[PDB]
Amino acid sequence: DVGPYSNLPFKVKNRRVPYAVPHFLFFAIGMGIPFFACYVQLKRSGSI
Amino acid sequence: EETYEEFSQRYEKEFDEAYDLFEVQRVLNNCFSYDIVPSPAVIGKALNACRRVNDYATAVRVFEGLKHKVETKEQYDAYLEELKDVREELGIDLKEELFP
Amino acid sequence: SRKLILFIVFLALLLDNMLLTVVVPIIPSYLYSIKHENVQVGLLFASKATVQLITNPFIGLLTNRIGYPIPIFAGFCIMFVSTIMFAFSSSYAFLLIARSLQGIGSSCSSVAGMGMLASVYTDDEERGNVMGIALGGLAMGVLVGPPFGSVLYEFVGKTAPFLVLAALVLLDGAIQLFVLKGTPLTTLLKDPYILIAAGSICFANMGIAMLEPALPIWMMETMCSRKWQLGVAFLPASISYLIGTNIFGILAHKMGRWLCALLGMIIVGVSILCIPFAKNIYGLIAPNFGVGFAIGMVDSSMMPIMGYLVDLRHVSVYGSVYAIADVAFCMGYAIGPSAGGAIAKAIGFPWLMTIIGIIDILFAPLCFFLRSPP
Amino acid sequence: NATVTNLEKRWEDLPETDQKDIISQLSERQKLPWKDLTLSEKKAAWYISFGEWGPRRPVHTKEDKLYIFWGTVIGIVISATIFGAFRYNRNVPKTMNREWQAASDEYLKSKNAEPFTGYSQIQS
Amino acid sequence: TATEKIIELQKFYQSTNKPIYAAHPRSKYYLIPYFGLLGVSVAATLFYTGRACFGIKD
Amino acid sequence: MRIQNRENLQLFPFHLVTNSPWPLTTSLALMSLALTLGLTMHGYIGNHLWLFLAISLVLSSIFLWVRDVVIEGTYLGDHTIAVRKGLNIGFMLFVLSEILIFAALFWSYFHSAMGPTIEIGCQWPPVGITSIKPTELPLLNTIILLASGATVTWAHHSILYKDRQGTLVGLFITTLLIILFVGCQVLEYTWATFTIADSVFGSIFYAGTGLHFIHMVMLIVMLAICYARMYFYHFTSNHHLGLETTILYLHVLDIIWLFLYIVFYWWG
Amino acid sequence: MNYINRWLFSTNAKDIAVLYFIFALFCGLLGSIMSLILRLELSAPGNQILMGNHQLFNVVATAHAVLMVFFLVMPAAIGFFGNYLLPLMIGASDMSFARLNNISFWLLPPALVSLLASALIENGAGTGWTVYPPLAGVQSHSGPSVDLAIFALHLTSISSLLGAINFITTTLNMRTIGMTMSKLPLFVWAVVFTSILLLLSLPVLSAGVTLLLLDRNFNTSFFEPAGGGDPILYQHLFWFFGHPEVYILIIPGFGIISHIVSTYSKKPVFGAIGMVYAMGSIGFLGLLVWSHHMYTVGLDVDSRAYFTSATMVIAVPTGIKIFSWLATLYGGSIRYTTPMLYAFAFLFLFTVGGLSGVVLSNASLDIAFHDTYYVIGHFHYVLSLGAVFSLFAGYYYWSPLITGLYYNNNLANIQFWLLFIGTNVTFFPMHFLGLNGMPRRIPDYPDAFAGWNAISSFGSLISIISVILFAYVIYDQLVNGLTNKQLSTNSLFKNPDFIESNIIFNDNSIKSSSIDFLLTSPPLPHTFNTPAIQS
Amino acid sequence: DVPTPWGIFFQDSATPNMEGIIELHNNIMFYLVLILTFVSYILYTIIYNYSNATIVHKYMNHGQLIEIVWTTLPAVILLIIAFPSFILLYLCDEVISPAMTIKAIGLQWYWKYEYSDFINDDGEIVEFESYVIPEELLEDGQLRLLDVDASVVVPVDTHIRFIVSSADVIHDFCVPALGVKVDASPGRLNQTSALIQREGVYYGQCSELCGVMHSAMPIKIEAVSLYEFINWLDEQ
Amino acid sequence: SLTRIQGSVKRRILTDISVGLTLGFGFASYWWWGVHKPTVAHRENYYIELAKKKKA
Amino acid sequence: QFKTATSIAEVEGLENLVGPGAKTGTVPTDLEQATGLERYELLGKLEGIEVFDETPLEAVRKGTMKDPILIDSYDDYRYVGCTGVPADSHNIEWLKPTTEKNARCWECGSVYKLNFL
Numbered sequence A: 001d002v003g004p005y006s007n008l009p010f011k012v013k014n015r016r017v018p019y020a021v022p023h024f025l026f027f028a029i030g031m032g033i034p035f036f037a038c039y040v041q042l043k044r045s046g047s048i
Numbered sequence B: 001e002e003t004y005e006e007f008s009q010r011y012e013k014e015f016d017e018a019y020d021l022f023e024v025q026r027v028l029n030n031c032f033s034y035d036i037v038p039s040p041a042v043i044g045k046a047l048n049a050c051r052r053v054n055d056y057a058t059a060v061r062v063f064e065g066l067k068h069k070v071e072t073k074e075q076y077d078a079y080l081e082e083l084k085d086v087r088e089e090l091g092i093d094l095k096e097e098l099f100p
Numbered sequence C: 001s002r003k004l005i006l007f008i009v010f011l012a013l014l015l016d017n018m019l020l021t022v023v024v025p026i027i028p029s030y031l032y033s034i035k036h037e038n039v040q041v042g043l044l045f046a047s048k049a050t051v052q053l054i055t056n057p058f059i060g061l062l063t064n065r066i067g068y069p070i071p072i073f074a075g076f077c078i079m080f081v082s083t084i085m086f087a088f089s090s091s092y093a094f095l096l097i098a099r100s101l102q103g104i105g106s107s108c109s110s111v112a113g114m115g116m117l118a119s120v121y122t123d124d125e126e127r128g129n130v131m132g133i134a135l136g137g138l139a140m141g142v143l144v145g146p147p148f149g150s151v152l153y154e155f156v157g158k159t160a161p162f163l164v165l166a167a168l169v170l171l172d173g174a175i176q177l178f179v180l181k182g183t184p185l186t187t188l189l190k191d192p193y194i195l196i197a198a199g200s201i202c203f204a205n206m207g208i209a210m211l212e213p214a215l216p217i218w219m220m221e222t223m224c225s226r227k228w229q230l231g232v233a234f235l236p237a238s239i240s241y242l243i244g245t246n247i248f249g250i251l252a253h254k255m256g257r258w259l260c261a262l263l264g265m266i267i268v269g270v271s272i273l274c275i276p277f278a279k280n281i282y283g284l285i286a287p288n289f290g291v292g293f294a295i296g297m298v299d300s301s302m303m304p305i306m307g308y309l310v311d312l313r314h315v316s317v318y319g320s321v322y323a324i325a326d327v328a329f330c331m332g333y334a335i336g337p338s339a340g341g342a343i344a345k346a347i348g349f350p351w352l353m354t355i356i357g358i359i360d361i362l363f364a365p366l367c368f369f370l371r372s373p374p
Numbered sequence D: 001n002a003t004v005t006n007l008e009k010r011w012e013d014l015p016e017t018d019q020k021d022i023i024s025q026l027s028e029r030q031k032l033p034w035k036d037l038t039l040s041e042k043k044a045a046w047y048i049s050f051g052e053w054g055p056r057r058p059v060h061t062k063e064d065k066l067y068i069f070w071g072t073v074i075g076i077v078i079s080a081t082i083f084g085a086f087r088y089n090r091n092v093p094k095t096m097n098r099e100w101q102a103a104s105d106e107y108l109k110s111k112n113a114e115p116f117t118g119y120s121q122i123q124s
Numbered sequence E: 001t002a003t004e005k006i007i008e009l010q011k012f013y014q015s016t017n018k019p020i021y022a023a024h025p026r027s028k029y030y031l032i033p034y035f036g037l038l039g040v041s042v043a044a045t046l047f048y049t050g051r052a053c054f055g056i057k058d
Numbered sequence F: 001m002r003i004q005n006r007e008n009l010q011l012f013p014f015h016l017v018t019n020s021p022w023p024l025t026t027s028l029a030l031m032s033l034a035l036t037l038g039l040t041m042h043g044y045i046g047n048h049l050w051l052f053l054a055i056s057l058v059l060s061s062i063f064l065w066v067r068d069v070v071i072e073g074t075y076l077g078d079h080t081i082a083v084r085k086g087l088n089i090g091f092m093l094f095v096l097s098e099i100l101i102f103a104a105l106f107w108s109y110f111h112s113a114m115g116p117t118i119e120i121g122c123q124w125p126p127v128g129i130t131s132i133k134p135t136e137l138p139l140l141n142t143i144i145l146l147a148s149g150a151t152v153t154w155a156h157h158s159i160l161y162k163d164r165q166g167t168l169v170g171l172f173i174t175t176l177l178i179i180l181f182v183g184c185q186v187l188e189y190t191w192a193t194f195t196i197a198d199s200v201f202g203s204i205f206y207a208g209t210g211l212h213f214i215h216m217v218m219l220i221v222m223l224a225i226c227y228a229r230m231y232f233y234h235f236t237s238n239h240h241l242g243l244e245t246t247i248l249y250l251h252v253l254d255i256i257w258l259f260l261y262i263v264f265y266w267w268g
Numbered sequence G: 001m002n003y004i005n006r007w008l009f010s011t012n013a014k015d016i017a018v019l020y021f022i023f024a025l026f027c028g029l030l031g032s033i034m035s036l037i038l039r040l041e042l043s044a045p046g047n048q049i050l051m052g053n054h055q056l057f058n059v060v061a062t063a064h065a066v067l068m069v070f071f072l073v074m075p076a077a078i079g080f081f082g083n084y085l086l087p088l089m090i091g092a093s094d095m096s097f098a099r100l101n102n103i104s105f106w107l108l109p110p111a112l113v114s115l116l117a118s119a120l121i122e123n124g125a126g127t128g129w130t131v132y133p134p135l136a137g138v139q140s141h142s143g144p145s146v147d148l149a150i151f152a153l154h155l156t157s158i159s160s161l162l163g164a165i166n167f168i169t170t171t172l173n174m175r176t177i178g179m180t181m182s183k184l185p186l187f188v189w190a191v192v193f194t195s196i197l198l199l200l201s202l203p204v205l206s207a208g209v210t211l212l213l214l215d216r217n218f219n220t221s222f223f224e225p226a227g228g229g230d231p232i233l234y235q236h237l238f239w240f241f242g243h244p245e246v247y248i249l250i251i252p253g254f255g256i257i258s259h260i261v262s263t264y265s266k267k268p269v270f271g272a273i274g275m276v277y278a279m280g281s282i283g284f285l286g287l288l289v290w291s292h293h294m295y296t297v298g299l300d301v302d303s304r305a306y307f308t309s310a311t312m313v314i315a316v317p318t319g320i321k322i323f324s325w326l327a328t329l330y331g332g333s334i335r336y337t338t339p340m341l342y343a344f345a346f347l348f349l350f351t352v353g354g355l356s357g358v359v360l361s362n363a364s365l366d367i368a369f370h371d372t373y374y375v376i377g378h379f380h381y382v383l384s385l386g387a388v389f390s391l392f393a394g395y396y397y398w399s400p401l402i403t404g405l406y407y408n409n410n411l412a413n414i415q416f417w418l419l420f421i422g423t424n425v426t427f428f429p430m431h432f433l434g435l436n437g438m439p440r441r442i443p444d445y446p447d448a449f450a451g452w453n454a455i456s457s458f459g460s461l462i463s464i465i466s467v468i469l470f471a472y473v474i475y476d477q478l479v480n481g482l483t484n485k486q487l488s489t490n491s492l493f494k495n496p497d498f499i500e501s502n503i504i505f506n507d508n509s510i511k512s513s514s515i516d517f518l519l520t521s522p523p524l525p526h527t528f529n530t531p532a533i534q535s
Numbered sequence H: 001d002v003p004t005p006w007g008i009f010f011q012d013s014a015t016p017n018m019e020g021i022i023e024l025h026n027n028i029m030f031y032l033v034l035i036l037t038f039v040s041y042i043l044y045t046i047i048y049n050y051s052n053a054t055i056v057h058k059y060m061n062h063g064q065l066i067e068i069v070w071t072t073l074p075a076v077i078l079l080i081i082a083f084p085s086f087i088l089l090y091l092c093d094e095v096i097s098p099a100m101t102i103k104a105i106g107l108q109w110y111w112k113y114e115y116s117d118f119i120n121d122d123g124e125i126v127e128f129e130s131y132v133i134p135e136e137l138l139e140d141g142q143l144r145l146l147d148v149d150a151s152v153v154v155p156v157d158t159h160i161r162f163i164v165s166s167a168d169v170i171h172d173f174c175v176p177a178l179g180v181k182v183d184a185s186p187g188r189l190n191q192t193s194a195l196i197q198r199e200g201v202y203y204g205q206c207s208e209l210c211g212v213m214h215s216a217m218p219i220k221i222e223a224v225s226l227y228e229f230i231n232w233l234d235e236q
Numbered sequence I: 001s002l003t004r005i006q007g008s009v010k011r012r013i014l015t016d017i018s019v020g021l022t023l024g025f026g027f028a029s030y031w032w033w034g035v036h037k038p039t040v041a042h043r044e045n046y047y048i049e050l051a052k053k054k055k056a
Numbered sequence J: 001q002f003k004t005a006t007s008i009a010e011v012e013g014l015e016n017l018v019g020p021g022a023k024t025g026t027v028p029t030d031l032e033q034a035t036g037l038e039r040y041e042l043l044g045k046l047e048g049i050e051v052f053d054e055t056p057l058e059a060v061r062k063g064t065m066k067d068p069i070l071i072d073s074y075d076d077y078r079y080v081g082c083t084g085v086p087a088d089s090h091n092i093e094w095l096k097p098t099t100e101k102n103a104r105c106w107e108c109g110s111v112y113k114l115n116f117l
Ligand code: HEA
Pocket: G246, G247, G249, G250, G292, G293, G311, G314, G315, G316, G318, G319, G320, G322, G350, G351, G354, G355, G356, G357, G358, G360, G361, G362, G366, G369, G370, G371, G375, G379, G382, G383, H035, H039, H074, H075, H077, H078
């Protein structure tokens, strides 16, 4: 099954949930983890 | 290390033994890739090679590479006042006379 | 400033002994393809010792009248001329003249410079530290020089290694332009104990002196070694020195300096013997390490022994130990290469190394006498 | 005549089986001595080989540089609007006022400071 | 048979149809305990690294 | 490449490893070790039966790799001349890395020895810190290591002349002769009068002679795996890359010990 | 079970490069947001987002340095471009030690967990990127936070060492039938030279950090001056790793640029052998100069003089490479594809960043620039504008050959321009702030330093937009990537020469100097069955 | 001296050492500007002449004279730079007769100053501690995060030798205008010197990281005349 | 004649290295005679006027 | 797993490469214990046959279309790297000849064909 969508760990075509959801969640989680740590350590030290 | 008179013998020999169009274009592409502009004798061999292989576009594009290789416009017109019997005998028309 | 004078003299000694070893990876090979002799190359590496030993008596007289700075600048000029001659020289006479001039240049940058440091620092305690720091790069020169010459000889031409040194010398000379009766040596080379102490260093370093000219030729013939590799084989010894003088400098105070010297002689003798039985460049790593380590032990043990012997049996001056060591080193370097051709043309390279190793081993038992000197 | 005349406006829409028949008809028409070729054939032979189609098209057309320019501007107008929002809602301390930075100037004038190029703490 | 089973296990590991770490009839005793204890070790370092982010000590 | 039936065998001398689960398992074991060690030193665990389990899992993971690296050389038959050379180069590039952790420790000993601080009265091994006599058990260890270096060379010269009883005996004596080193150097830590925390001297002494301990337990394990893999007829007279790997590890350790005996016990 | 035996239990080198890429993007997004958080607190004087916490600003800076020196540049530049490309360029099927490749991948995800748990188990680990001894003790940082960041520099170290051994042992004995070690492409030389430095430098860092851990937890007094130790020792044992480190991040970039300049300027590299010796010299002279980071600690005047001289010599080898790249671009034809724009933006910005290094190597001038934002502006031009640009160029160069899918040129150009403008607006004013005297690692600053801090916080929001557009470019590459090869002639690896006819070009299209661009669109899982031949 | 709002260049100097630093920096910038202009011009030429060019010179790949010219020319610049650097490194220092000594001990988040002279028979040595004035307690016009309650006061035209040590962690004594940046490690004594040529107030900030409130540790040095120094010293 | 052209790129290289250095020396001789020297002059004239006040 | 080979004429696969066994009480030799692609090398070097060739390609003659240089391949393609007729003159251009088309080397012009084995 060698071809253009064979060497990627994830499926991109012929998919139930459209690929935009998995693509967006990846970047959202990546850019939201550094804010969760700040929230935790701000709420652990009295600050809002 | 190679002189003008050895350049202009080696490339004449190369042009008199091309057998296909790929080879004519290969030898033409590695001729216009030095610091020496090809002599009027070498280009006289290039056009005969293009006539043996039966190609017209390559014979028009040779004259269009000279005007980019040469430095001024007087040199280009000095190449065309001596390669005029070869053109009017083979039938080659420059690009500025076709307007393609 | 005092610190700038120390910098000047340190860099002068470093450049002088750096140019004495970049020659080694190069000239033995350069004068080996022009032909396409042993004594000839052996004497090319021995003009420096003779010239320096003959010029030491008169540089002092020169430095008495004119003073310190002008003789120092003369070492500049002579060494720059020598490096330029080595830069462009394919005739054996020119290289021999360059090595001959190097001796005068080196002797002028040592007798005058050390005196300048002595004059500036008159404390009798800071003098020891300053003189020690200045003489430390003297050994670094033959640690940073052999590899550089071989690498730039393989990668680039002959003149590339020999013009960098000229540029550095010129920087040193520009900085120089910007900045500006004890018991005699003769008598101190009369009492037997200091004679033994000096002979220890002489016979210890004769091995490296003989290895310097002869080793590249044997390596090229029996080894098919490349141009760069000639430097690398000499790396393990020099690095070994920097180890041996750090550990066995304090250890000899509690193990007995005499015992340290006696053991070092045996170790260096065995290391010298093991060299002829090498077939690959990896085989040279061990014997070179041994020779460097043993020479480090012998120096670090014997030299303070000379200081103590001189200041007990006689009355002493600061340059007394330095003068003794200069005469020892120069005599060894004169003798070694000079006898190298004679003892390597009639008989093979293994034989000369075996003779020197047996000589070192047999000189080892004499170190018992220095224990409990009168 | 019609098959070769005006191939600059039709060449790329033809399939790849009507393109190998024009080339296979100009390769048996070039074996004849030239000066027997019509001008349309001469121009078509030049265009088919050395012409601005296929592998010889520009990387950037005139309608792509405008797109890139107006894409960069619309990316610098978003960052500006995000930065202004984080700029109105600032914590401005008591010191960042002109009536306070004119008081510090009197001090720095009395204790002569920046005798060269200048002292001035006024930035409102 | 004799101590040279080498010419009998060389005909077994070739022509096996199973992965080489689970072909011999002894890999059970190595692979069941190991995978069993690995899942407890990894489930104890994830219970104490979430119980520590909340400040709970022992 | 013009041999008759050549397509039926591989056309290059290199090993295409089958898919294995060990890299993931070792990584998960190291994760648990790291987090459990970083917590147990600061509360948050209490019971020390988790750290021990993590260490056991790591060691079992290496053992289970090495099983599959032995079934591919003795049974399946994939170590040509090229693969063996690659394995040798790799092992040398790990021994070199293990030698450069000792250089850091030696430079941490010469950065404190030469330049002793004001707080400690300027003297090596300082007042109140009685050193270990280097004419006692730390000579017996050096004689033992030199002997072990010579007993393994009688094991490699008996597998080339085809003596089985004479390659098993040498390995046995060598393995019994590195256990005595560990015993002597564990009887010299229980008979010492200075701990890790009483100076900068007892903290570098037990960090260059404590890493050597860990490196000498590994020799016992390697030599046991080399005696047991010879008892079961796994080594030929020209294809034995476990003996050669174990011999170049013994010699490096001996040379390193000769620099921890003249720089740590004698120098000072 | 076919999924698990290919993407968890793996042996293939090109299946691990993709996982490195997907990990690098994640760990470069985290660090970028942590940089935005710093750059939103350093906008106007006062306490703006992090309400008053001066901790949680140092934690963010430490996690921004670690996440994006050890988790973004190294994995991308050594794993995604080393693992995938080196075996193909030298002609090898797979690497010599495949299971070591898998372990080198899998030690990283468990190294991110420890670092992220070092920011939630207590106030955090705000020791700076360089974990200096007397602050990283048990009197200021009392908790399992510094330990859990030290264990993130051990797993990464093991991964890097195991990868380096594989790289050195694969390029020595796994070459093709006629490929000697003088015909190798320049990228292979870059990986070999970085892999030698990794072997020679990592153990010192391991020793130093382990000794710090022992001092914290077992009371050893290595770096306590009340038992006979000196903190300065740590600095030595760190910076011996510190300076080789900063070259490990840049040597793999150099090779990439060479390839780009050799393709879009249809000319071979001027003096390839010279470039090999230049990389070797840069690597060798990166071990002998490590104390220019510490001139204010109280060194002698004869050690400053040596380290001033030994640092300026590195300029000579790098000048050779810069001038050789200009010489190789000079005579030839240049087409401005998206890799070549990044190649041009690396030849100018790296020079601007490295010329500030010769102003900081002097011991006399480092009294005015040490612990100052001049250093920050220095290393951002060589890290953010030199190494990240090389990574982007490598992605846009080799993505079509890996995936078989093409990318929109217009969007890539927009992204390039936004990165260029934002990075040049964010880091340049740091030079002015440094000259006027602004120290490092300060959350709040005096009122005088406000203005440039407001211009340097406007560029960060222009670079984050570039990152988002990069995400959308990947989306258009994966979705409808097959139909993006006819929009522009950027798809072509090389245009026709002057006299080469289009018909002849279409038959003979790929003219290359490496085996990379002759392979299939996605390379076959087993690429080389019968060995390749070289003359 | 105080920072200015939109600064581009150094602060104003008050000591010979800072003047030497400025002069050496401006000397190096000469050659750096030369090299940057050269590289930029060649890139401009490449873009302007050789963009989408028909002729490709694929045989100019070796060079021999040009390769020796970019290996020797950059070396000459390095020697030219290295000369003044070594002269400045070895020349400017406290060669003769230091005249006053101030011990600056850096505690966690304040400074402690002792004046080693001015000692009575019973140990009456003058000493004080410098803290930061918080924002709430600032008076009209005082500078935020730089103004201290007690300021170091020294005479003009007198050598001042600072001995820097620390009690907790690694700090850094830094006053930019005077050209002083020395480190303060917990078990060693470091030293710097300064000669101040004009009267005024000179502000500075800590450099090395020390923890939470590393942003609040200012240094303030006044250079009063000798009479005012005598009057100051006779009240403390 | 006009049909013998031999070397053209070498002259271009020589002209393009002899103009990238004239520009550099011009843009570096403005940093040392228009940005640096007047600053030193202003600094010195400040000090030769702060001393005359003290002398008076 | 089947009949054992005695030379490389009787090796039809990996079923012919198991071998006899050693005898109890001796160090076994490589002709008595070796199986896979290791015993194939032994069986080849004991006759002179090098199973894994390391000969670079022909750089003695150029190649025309009538008389092309014949590269031997067990696949439909093989990667060929050309450096010239004097064998290091031309720089390196990589080529992929197949069973349907011949490589041609855009600088020197050497043509390459496959002999499919
Ligand atoms: C990753 C990028 C990178 C690279 C490649 C380098 C390499 C170099 N670095 Fe390194 N450096 C860092 C990033 C980098 N550095 C970082 C992050 C730190 C420490 C930050 C910290 O720890 O907090 C550091 C440390 C550091 C310091 C310590 C700063 C301090 O704390 O005081 C200094 C200067 O002292 C310095 C300068 C240099 C120089 C001169 C080079 C040279 O290799 C660059 C040479 C480049 C040129 C010379 C261009 C050549 C162009 C030519 C046209 C040649 C012309 C020839 C001449 C000018 C003679 N670096």
